[PDB]
Amino acid sequence: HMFFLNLKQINDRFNTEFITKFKEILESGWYILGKQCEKFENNFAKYCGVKHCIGVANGLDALRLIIKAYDFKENDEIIVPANTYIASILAITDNKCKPILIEPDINTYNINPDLIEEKITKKTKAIMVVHLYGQVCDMEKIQLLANKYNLKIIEDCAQAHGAIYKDKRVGNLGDAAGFSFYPGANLGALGDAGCICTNDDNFASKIRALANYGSHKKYENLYTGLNSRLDEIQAAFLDIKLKYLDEDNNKRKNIANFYLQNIKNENIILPSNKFDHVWHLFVVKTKLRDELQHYLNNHDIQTIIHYPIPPHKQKCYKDLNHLKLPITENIHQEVLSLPISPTMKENDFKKVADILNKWKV
Amino acid sequence: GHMFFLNLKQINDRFNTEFITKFKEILESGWYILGKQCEKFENNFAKYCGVKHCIGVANGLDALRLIIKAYDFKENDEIIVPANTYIASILAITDNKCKPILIEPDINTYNINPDLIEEKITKKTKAIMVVHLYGQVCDMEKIQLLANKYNLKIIEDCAQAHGAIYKDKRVGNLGDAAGFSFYPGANLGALGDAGCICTNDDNFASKIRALANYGSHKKYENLYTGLNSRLDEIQAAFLDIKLKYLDEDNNKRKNIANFYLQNIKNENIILPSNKFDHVWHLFVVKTKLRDELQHYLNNHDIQTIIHYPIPPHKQKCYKDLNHLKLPITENIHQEVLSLPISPTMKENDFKKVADILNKWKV
Numbered sequence: 001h002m003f004f005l006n007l008k009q010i011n012d013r014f015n016t017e018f019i020t021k022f023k024e025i026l027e028s029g030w031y032i033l034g035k036q037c038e039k040f041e042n043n044f045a046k047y048c049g050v051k052h053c054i055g056v057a058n059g060l061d062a063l064r065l066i067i068k069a070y071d072f073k074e075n076d077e078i079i080v081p082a083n084t085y086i087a088s089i090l091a092i093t094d095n096k097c098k099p100i101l102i103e104p105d106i107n108t109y110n111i112n113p114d115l116i117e118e119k120i121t122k123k124t125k126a127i128m129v130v131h132l133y134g135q136v137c138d139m140e141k142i143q144l145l146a147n148k149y150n151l152k153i154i155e156d157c158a159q160a161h162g163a164i165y166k167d168k169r170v171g172n173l174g175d176a177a178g179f180s181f182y183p184g185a186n187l188g189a190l191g192d193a194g195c196i197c198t199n200d201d202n203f204a205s206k207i208r209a210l211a212n213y214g215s216h217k218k219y220e221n222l223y224t225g226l227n228s229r230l231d232e233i234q235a236a237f238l239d240i241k242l243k244y245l246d247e248d249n250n251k252r253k254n255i256a257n258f259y260l261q262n263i264k265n266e267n268i269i270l271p272s273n274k275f276d277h278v279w280h281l282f283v284v285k286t287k288l289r290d291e292l293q294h295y296l297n298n299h300d301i302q303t304i305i306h307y308p309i310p311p312h313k314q315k316c317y318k319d320l321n322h323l324k325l326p327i328t329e330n331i332h333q334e335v336l337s338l339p340i341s342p343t344m345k346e347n348d349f350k351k352v353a354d355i356l357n358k359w360k361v
Numbered sequence: 362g363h364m365f366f367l368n369l370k371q372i373n374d375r376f377n378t379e380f381i382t383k384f385k386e387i388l389e390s391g392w393y394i395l396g397k398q399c400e401k402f403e404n405n406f407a408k409y410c411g412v413k414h415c416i417g418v419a420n421g422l423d424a425l426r427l428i429i430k431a432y433d434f435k436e437n438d439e440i441i442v443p444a445n446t447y448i449a450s451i452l453a454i455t456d457n458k459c460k461p462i463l464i465e466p467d468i469n470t471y472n473i474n475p476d477l478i479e480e481k482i483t484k485k486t487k488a489i490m491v492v493h494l495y496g497q498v499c500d501m502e503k504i505q506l507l508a509n510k511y512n513l514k515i516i517e518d519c520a521q522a523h524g525a526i527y528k529d530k531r532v533g534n535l536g537d538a539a540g541f542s543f544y545p546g547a548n549l550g551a552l553g554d555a556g557c558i559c560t561n562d563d564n565f566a567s568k569i570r571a572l573a574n575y576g577s578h579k580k581y582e583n584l585y586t587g588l589n590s591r592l593d594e595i596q597a598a599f600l601d602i603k604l605k606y607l608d609e610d611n612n613k614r615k616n617i618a619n620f621y622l623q624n625i626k627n628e629n630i631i632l633p634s635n636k637f638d639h640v641w642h643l644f645v646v647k648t649k650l651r652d653e654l655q656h657y658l659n660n661h662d663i664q665t666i667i668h669y670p671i672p673p674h675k676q677k678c679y680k681d682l683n684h685l686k687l688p689i690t691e692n693i694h695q696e697v698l699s700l701p702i703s704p705t706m707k708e709n710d711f712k713k714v715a716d717i718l719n720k721w722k723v
């Protein structure tokens with residue numbers, strides 16, 4: 001079977017250095033908040049063009065912490081795309097803020113900036129942008145609304161490592177940014193991992209303390225914090241792979257281009273890349289989505305849906321189930337992700353295209 | 362020749378070849394989260410604690426936070442807890458919008474004084490969190506009775522007390538649910554952050570598994586508003602390797618602690634004589650001249666750490682508790698200092714600690 005995402009193929013490239021670094025860490029006797037974390041932070045901050053990177057435990061923790069650090073009041077509002085992955089929302093509700101869900105543009109799969117302002121109220125305190133599937137969101141009007149209404153901009157960068165907008169990288173487009181380095185991310189760890197990026201010295205220092213039980217200095221707790229740290233081992237593996245991240249994204253770009261140039265099937269709506277797209281996911285759209293996934297599985301092609309139930313329709317968010325979000329709803333009914341990975345072989349991506357072209361429904 | 366407080370390199374060096382072997386196994390698998398290593402570790406740790414269910418999670422604070430979250434308590438519900446525990450025990454309560462009710466310890470065990478608990482029970486009380494502090498199991502008998510009398514949950518914080526035994530059961534199996542840290546300095550320590558939740562209750566275990574996986578029990582679906590709190594395959598594997606030697610290692614710590622208890626004799630030092638089973642995560646001595654003694658031991662090339670010098674109610678993050686009068690707690694925090702102990706600690710190292718203490722005239 002062709003895997004959706006063959007992480008062994010992706011990581012095998014680095015095994016020798018993974019084992020060297022692991023042995024270096026064993027020799028150091030230091031496994032938490034050490035030289036590897038510092039090195040990776042400094043390199044990832046450089047990569048994103050930001051002053052400060054704080055290694056944390058995962059992408060949801062990254063968001064949760066950013067919101068926490070802003071000390072919003074219970075029920076304050078955070079504008080967010082309605083079609084993002086549920087963890088973007090969980091971060092908001094975990095802080096007892098209210099998610100205000102906005103429809104995406106069908107031609108980007110990202111928040112439609114034109115639909116935000118109408119939803120801003122006295123309680124709105126932040127906009128969470130999500131660079132979904134790999135494509136950076138059009139920030140122009142979002143930044144204008146943030147300045148106009150005194151809103152924080154929070155970036156969810158879990159799916160768009162390295163994507164660029166004008167002169168900047170995702171991670172440097174708002175006030176603070178959360179990354180996942182979950183193993184399937186464009187920069188993936190060998191375990192759970194994440195980070196927070198910002199230019200604000202004071203916010204950075206708060207965040208560090210907050211992710212370390214609320215302790216800035218040994219023995220002392222300035223805040224009621226969490227334990228959300230990036231392990232030395234994972235920092236070291238990330239730093240190894242970071243050197244190849246733009247290359248790996250360019251290998252995705254190549255595959256996505258092959259798909260775009262070769263899949264010709266009237267039942268399939270292909271993704272476009274209006275702005276920079278690092279192609280974490282290659283998302284097609286069809287009225288016969290389940291049929292297509294079954295067909296592809298018959299042809300030994302593994303696929304995953306991102307995503308078939310939207311946050312507002314989840315059982316955990318019963319109070320949202322009534323919201324009318326037909327664009328988001330229709331997307332969740334229609335999308336399927338095609339295998340794409342930096343290391344994916346030409347014969348595999350050729351086969352995917354050929355089998356999709358043969359789909360006659 | 363500086364004696365390190367806890368020489369983890371020396372603790373872990375015994376397992377290096379095994380660690381590397383398993384790491385390469387995991388690379389071969391291409392599975393790094395929620396895999397075979399986690400399942401295997403959980404199964405073994407559950408057997409070790411004598412419980413039905415072990416759920417690996419990201420760290421010990423998360424473990425406690427998830428337990429409390431799983432019980433779905435009302436805002437401002439009360440959780441009885443020792444006043445002298447590590448702050449993380451409290452953070453787990455307040456993060457869940459519950460109210461901690463701080464109970465003085467017994468001066469001679471450093472654990473919650475069970476005889477002070479009932480007077481603080483109210484209609485809002487939902488649970489007692491017991492903490493097995495420093496490695497000493499709490500005297501659970503009265504605590505379990507009380508919990509039954511008032512229909513309260515017992516939550517164990519087992520971060521410092523891996524493998525200790527109260528009568529016929531292990532820590533982990535002494536309440537309704539138990540949180541463990543496997544922070545690297547723990548008696549069973551990982552090589553990064555790690556924890557677990559132990560319980561006998563099937564529904565509680567499944568609910569915890571979902572709550573630690575975004576709230577998701579089934580791919581694509583979220584039953585609860587959860588969090589991401591998982592035990593990496595690599596840390597599970599490392600923990601499984603060391604779990605085979607944990608009872609041996611704990612008994613080695615007992616040997617060294619009993620050396621200290623029997624060989625240190627100084628009128629300025631109160632030794633931690635144990636009233637119940639103790640696995641000696643920390644060996645805590647107590648003196649009126651604590652800062653003086655730490656400087657004395659540093660001068661003699663012996664590194665110590667304090668557990669702890671500021672109690673939770675006096676921290677800046679808990680300004681609304683700073684007023685509470687907890688004199689036993691406050692006194693302990695002024696007077697405690699931890700001595701180096703470990704299962705690999707060299708004879709000449711512990712003998713030097715004892716001798717240098719015996720020489721201290723203050």
Ligand SMILES: Cc1ncc(COP(=O)(O)O)c(/C=N/[C@H]2[C@@H](O)[C@@H](C)O[C@H](OP(=O)(O)OP(=O)(O)OC[C@H]3O[C@@H](n4cc(C)c(=O)[nH]c4=O)C[C@@H]3O)[C@@H]2O)c1O
Nearest residue numbers: 029030031032227366367369420421422447449520542546
């Ligand atoms: C009762 C109770 N409940 C819940 C919790 C929360 O559990 P966690 O969320 O898993 O931390 C704790 C945690 N309790 C721990 C932790 O929260 C920890 C960070 O702080 C204290 O422990 P301590 O002050 O001894 O920790 P440390 O960082 O100084 O490490 C101990 C020694 O080991 C050495 N070392 C350490 C590291 C990390 C290394 O890589 N290499 C190395 O050689 C350095 C030190 O000499 C607490 O007692 C607790 O005690």
Ligand SMILES: Cc1ncc(COP(=O)(O)O)c(/C=N/[C@H]2[C@@H](O)[C@@H](C)O[C@H](OP(=O)(O)OP(=O)(O)OC[C@H]3O[C@@H](n4cc(C)c(=O)[nH]c4=O)C[C@@H]3O)[C@@H]2O)c1O
Nearest residue numbers: 004005007058059060085087158180184391392393394589
């Ligand atoms: C927009 C946004 N914001 C915040 C977050 C929260 O970030 P975290 O808290 O770090 O997860 C996410 C996470 N987003 C991710 C994650 O939450 C993740 C668990 O679930 C989805 O991703 P997906 O359905 O693709 O994940 P998956 O587990 O199926 O793995 C992808 C593939 O990789 C293969 N695999 C996976 C693993 C773990 C392995 O060891 N070996 C292996 O071969 C199996 C699959 O074929 C989400 O899109 C997000 O998309």
Ligand SMILES: [Cl-]
Nearest residue numbers: 295298299358
């Ligand atoms: Cl067919």
Ligand code: NA
Nearest residue numbers: 057192419554
């Ligand atoms: Na972790």
